[PDB]
């Protein structure tokens, strides 16, 4: 509905949506059609979603170590690839081979044990595993 | 400009490695004034994106308490615990753990808050502060 920030109406829609209200119920409270509210909520979620990728890029460039995984690679061969670079660059990965498997199973573009598309697994500055769907430069 | 361009990303990448603005200007083939405009503009996008995620996490908060300018910081814990037990009160912080939080990350001058803010517990059970006050919308219907 706008750019660079969330307007009052976008704040009011998502707050009523989080409380469990249906678009048709919100349409009566604001006095508008539910079709426009469906478009407004779509723009609000699209704006937050685009802002989330900005924080991911900011945390990815400030990462201690990053590992790329191509489409089709096994999910179980990621730990050995990550810990391999953890020796050349003398840093500490505070997770085990099974600690990061449970991480990739939850929030990583994977179909069963096979990766769907390309993604990047990196460890940020706060020692927290995070996922990024952006292959980048040197 | 709804995202970070490849040139803004390349600037922040070279800057994260420890390069100075004068050194970055030569690699990209542009003036140091352009690097100053882009890097300042790039950090402004990251700052604006944080407020979007912060408000998004405030809307998805389990419990939220508003604090107005002039109110005491010490009456906030009793106010939070009072309203937290309406639902399943799961604030795993003590009366002193959230006071030490407000002293660290809250707009307060000595014992009095400077401007209005909201103390809420997000989805990860961690205290957060937002200068928004959206509880007026929780009183419709």
Numbering used by the authors:
A (entry chain B): 2 to 139
B (entry chain A): 4 to 144
Quote the study on this structure.
Thermococcus onnurineus NA1, a hyperthermophilic carboxydotrophic archaeon, produces H2 through CO oxidation catalyzed by proteins encoded in a carbon monoxide dehydrogenase (CODH) gene cluster. TON_1525 with a DNA-binding helix-turn-helix (HTH) motif is a putative repressor regulating the transcriptional expression of the codh gene cluster. Monomeric TON_1525 adopts a novel ‘eighth note’ symbol-like fold (referred to as ‘eighth note’ fold regulator, EnfR), and the dimerization mode of EnfR is unique in that it has no resemblance to structures in the Protein Data Bank. According to footprinting and gel shift assays, dimeric EnfR binds to a 36-bp pseudo-palindromic inverted repeat in the promoter region of the codh gene cluster, which is supported by an in silico EnfR/DNA complex model and mutational studies revealing the implication of N-terminal loops as well as HTH motifs in DNA recognition.
The T55I mutation in TON_1525 led to enhanced H2 production accompanied by the increased expression of genes in the codh cluster. The KD values of the wild-type and the T55I mutant were calculated to be 61.8 ± 20.5 and 948.0 ± 130.0 nM, respectively, clearly indicating that the DNA-binding affinity of the mutant is much lower (over fifteen-fold) than that of the wild-type. To get structural insights into the reduced DNA-binding activity of the T55I mutant, we determined its 3.4 Å resolution crystal structure. The overall structures of the monomeric and dimeric T55I mutant are virtually identical to those of the wide-type. The r.m.s. deviations of monomers and dimers between the mutant and the wild-type are 0.827 and 0.941 Å, respectively, for all Cα atoms. Despite this structural resemblance, however, the T55I mutant has a remarkable structural difference in the orientation and conformation of the N-6 region that is engaged in DNA recognition. In contrast, in the case of the T55I mutant, the N-6 region runs in a different direction due to the loss of the hydrogen bond, which is the consequence of the isoleucine replacement at position 55. In this conformation of the two N-6 regions, the two phenylalanine residues cannot form π–π stacking interactions. In the resulting complex model, it was obvious that the N-6 region of the mutant clashes with DNA. Consequently, it can be concluded that the altered conformation of the N-6 region induced by the T55I mutation disturbs the DNA-binding activity of the mutant, and the conformation of T55I mutant is not adequate in DNA-binding.
